[PDB]
Amino acid sequence: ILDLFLKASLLVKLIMLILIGFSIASWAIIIQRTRILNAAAREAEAFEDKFWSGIELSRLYQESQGKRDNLTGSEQIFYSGFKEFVRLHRANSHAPEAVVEGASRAMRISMNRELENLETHIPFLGTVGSISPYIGLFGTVWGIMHAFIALGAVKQATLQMVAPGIAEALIATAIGLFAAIPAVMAYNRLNQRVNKLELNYDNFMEEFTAILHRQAFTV
Amino acid sequence: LDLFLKASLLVKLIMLILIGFSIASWAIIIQRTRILNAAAREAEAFEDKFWSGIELSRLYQESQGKRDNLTGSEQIFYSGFKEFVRLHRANSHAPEAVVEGASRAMRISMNRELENLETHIPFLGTVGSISPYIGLFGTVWGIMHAFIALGAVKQATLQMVAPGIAEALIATAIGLFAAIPAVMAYNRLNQRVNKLELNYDNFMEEFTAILHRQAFTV
Amino acid sequence: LDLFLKASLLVKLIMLILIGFSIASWAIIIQRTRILNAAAREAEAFEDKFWSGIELSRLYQESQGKRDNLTGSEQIFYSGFKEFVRLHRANSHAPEAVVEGASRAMRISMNRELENLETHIPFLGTVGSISPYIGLFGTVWGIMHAFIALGAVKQATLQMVAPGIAEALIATAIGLFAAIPAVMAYNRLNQRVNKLELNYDNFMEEFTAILHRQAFTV
Amino acid sequence: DLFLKASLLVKLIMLILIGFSIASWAIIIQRTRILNAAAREAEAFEDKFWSGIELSRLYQESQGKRDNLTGSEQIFYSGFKEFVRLHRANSHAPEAVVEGASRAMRISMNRELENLETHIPFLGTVGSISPYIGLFGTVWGIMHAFIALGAVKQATLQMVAPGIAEALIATAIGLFAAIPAVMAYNRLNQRVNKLELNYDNFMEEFTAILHRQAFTV
């Protein structure tokens, strides 16, 4: 029933392949993004609760190394910041401001690393949402002109050789419109949820940096 | 080309102009993309190596082993530390005053790094906006020619005006080429370049903090 | 020629609501531009009248008689200063809390002032956000009626459905009428709102700082 | 080549479009010229400062050319003038003077900006509204010709296209005006932002050094 490529010029086939697998890539990105975002979300409340669940400062670090490499999110931020904190503290590191700023350094850099490595493939969604109808319009208008120039070779409104051109026009515009929906479905919701992730990661940042501040002025 | 040839020279002229923009745009995309991607990971390599339990003067002499071929955060470090030591030399600015000149040196080096990495980028924005409008500029003129021609002939109902507006619509088609890659490249390279800008910026702040600490201890 | 007493008496209503939206938006542009210009004019005037170097008490004495006639920064200063003097007279157990009390009085005064200051802009944001959609719906309805009419005429002659399609094209053309002016005014005047509230913001923190230093010296 | 045949409304549209187009080109020429100029003087001034020149010497030099003190250096002049004015009024505090100084620098900043871009918003809105003006021209032409189409019915095969072209030339000239505006808009905006960042850094470091060392003097 999908007799598309059998009767297809080079350009229509080009745009169709440029858009179909592109859309399936758009859904694959949806699946991966929602999976990782939900996984991080469920970890967020649990870890934040365990922050003040009676686990003293050192104990969380001592138990963190069990999953040292397979560590992510706020817990990974904790691991990096606190391990470099104790690295500095085991040395002289006499200046409290020095250790505090090193803590801020490590926390914010690890928080960034998590923010980007979780936040991937996202602007591609906006790009496709922008240019998918425009590519369809290209295919359609080229189909229009390709048949309209040929129309100037006959006299009567034959309408028999134009039908392939009409099919090309409809196919181009339809496939161009096809990818528009999932693009915007991804972009806004994913961006807002990632912004919430950034918000509570920042919360963790200033919170545990204040904790480390008070700890450094405590020891 | 077979059906492209129109008597109006403006059509050929503007199509060649757009094709030239097509060449420039794609060349800029691939070249700036490769250069920017190559320069990207060097920043994180420096970030890892810098604080991997090393001494600042060791990194400075290492950079002095890599003179006059220096790019990225290594250049920022070299400029900042050479400015620091030269302004920290005997009978010079106060310990709290050298850091301002050092910050200026690192910052102007950082700016230079931006534009010499961000060289051809705004051309993408310039071309992307104008290209469809140029395509319409062509097609309206072609339609004017075709319609004044149609004004005199009798009958020939839709059997002669075909090229007069088909080779006008091609102007819009070529304008539509010229818009697509340019805008996406402009965007994505803007976010990547601003990411690098933020990296270098923060690095400047904590490096100024480190220099203040050194001046306190030196 | 009106070319208006020809449609199905629904697209006509669409055109009426569209032209009414355009007129209302235009009136809003006039009114809000006028009041924004007046506020901008008063801004720098209060700026230099405040920081001419006169005492705070003298400035408040100049005020307190124009209370209901105050507007913008005048009202902000009056409300905050009134709360400041009230709390200082009453509490007398606020070594450093009167500053936050005055800050919150200033802040709530600012919140109500800005609630007053950009009242009608979201109407422009909405009308600019909706014009092309409703216009496209209107022309869709028009062409729908036109094609529903053509279901009995033999040969499917198309030249006789000309008025319906022509007025549908007018409907989409007039449908896009308020789209561009509305959004243009929206953006342009929102920029002015942003800069003015930034002026109010820097006003806010230097006022808070000077009150912080000066409040506890009495 | 149909200006005289154009209706009064079409006359008005084409006239405003061509006027705004010529205004756009004039804006591009003059404003980019002064932009490049101010860039050169800003770079020269930045080179001059931190050259071992005492602040009083630079202030005296600015007094020498105060009338023609165009560029970034009027920020420095206004800042030093405010600083000395506040210092004469010795009834002040270490952090009281710097606040007023920063206010003086930022109001001088806004002065320099509002001089620096005047017609750039005009470019933005003309680029935004040009195709809408073309829409006005086309719709008026189409309805005016459709009146004649309804006046006589013979299917009017041939004597329509000239009117369509005379309506479409409105959009042609409108977008022709749009082209220079849209190319120049962001081109000048990014330069303006660059200069804004330069001035912001200048103000920041100037207040820093004034608060740190110039407090004694």
Binding site: - | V183 | - | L135, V160
Partner: peptide, 21 residues
Amino acid sequence: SEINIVPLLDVLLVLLLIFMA
């Protein structure tokens, strides 16, 4: 930063009106 083709509707109208005659 964004592609703007809104003048093209005028071409749409011009192409459309040339048939009904």
